[PDB]
Amino acid sequence: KNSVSVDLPGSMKVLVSKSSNADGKYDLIATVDALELSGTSDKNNGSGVLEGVKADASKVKLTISDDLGQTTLEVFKSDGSTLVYKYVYSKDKSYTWEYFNEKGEVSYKYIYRADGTRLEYTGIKSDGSGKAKEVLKGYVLEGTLTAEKTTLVVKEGTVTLSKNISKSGEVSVELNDTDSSAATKKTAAWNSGTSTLTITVNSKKTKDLVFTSSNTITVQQYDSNGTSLEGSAVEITKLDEIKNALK
Incomplete structure (x- = not known):
């Protein structure tokens, strides 16, 4: 030949x-x-x-x-x-x-990332809205799609963690807690350079959740003063562990 x-x-x-x-x-x-x-x-x-x-x-x-x-x-x-x-x-x-x-509009999209994690978009409408699922090793995150961003949501008690993925693929994470007690209300801040969510309770940092370039999440606690990290970061492998980090 x-x-x-x-x-x-x-x-x-x-x-x-x-x-x-x-x-x-x-x-x-x-x-x-x-x-x-x-x-x-x-x-x-x-x-x-x-x-x-x-x-x-x-x-x-x-x-x-x-x-x-x-x-x-x-x-x-x-x-x-x-x-x-x-x-x-x-x-x-x-x-x-x-x-x-039949009009040539995308109705379903599935992305299989090189690392084996996936994104699935269903029921996509003309305004670019739809339903979203991210499939990670060990757990699935569920959420929604808009023309702006994908938002994946994990709820635990009065806390809602929202993982946003921009149209360019940039991850950013927000946390809201409806608890109004200073003793227990979670708040958080986001470091865009290291893709890290730092959670604070009662004026003290409690944990860093790192959203890695491997599409995993790690959690690491702070000491009792909130002024040094302690132990070593632990990779989350199940949904229950994300929820535990939000308690």
Whole structure:
């Protein structure tokens, strides 16, 4: 065979001709779950566009970025005008699936992060609102979506912890406690550089909750004066431990 195989970031395979044709372009072939796609490219690294048509006449397009770092697989209605499905691998980043309704609006989105943690958005409406779930190792956080941000909520007693994720992926966390007693009301402050929520009760720092770049949470207590950390930070592995930290 006059082709060579390329195993892309994200593990889709594309066959590229060893040499170019009279137009200087290379032939591309790929098989995506049993359907063969074909195209040509002015590069020979596996980048470019491939197309095919499903048995039901849906149009399929595979687009591989010039640096190989991004793979997009799109399925459209039979006239090619409206998306039905879009998968994107973003190298060392995430696998994302979008499903679209008949107007070509996203109705469902699932993000599988490189670290194995996930985000799922359901019942997405025209104003960009919806329901949100984050799937971490050991526990699930539930919340909501707006056009501004995702807000995941954990409640314990009179305390509500809100983990916000901006449209750019930036995490910030807020805490509100309806308790009005100085002895027991939790309040918190957020350090955006270290992604740390420091909780204070009765004028004394009690705990730091760190929201790590690995999409885990750690908790560490302060001493009885609130003026030094004590022990060592402990990675949370269950929902009960988040709730315990909010007591």
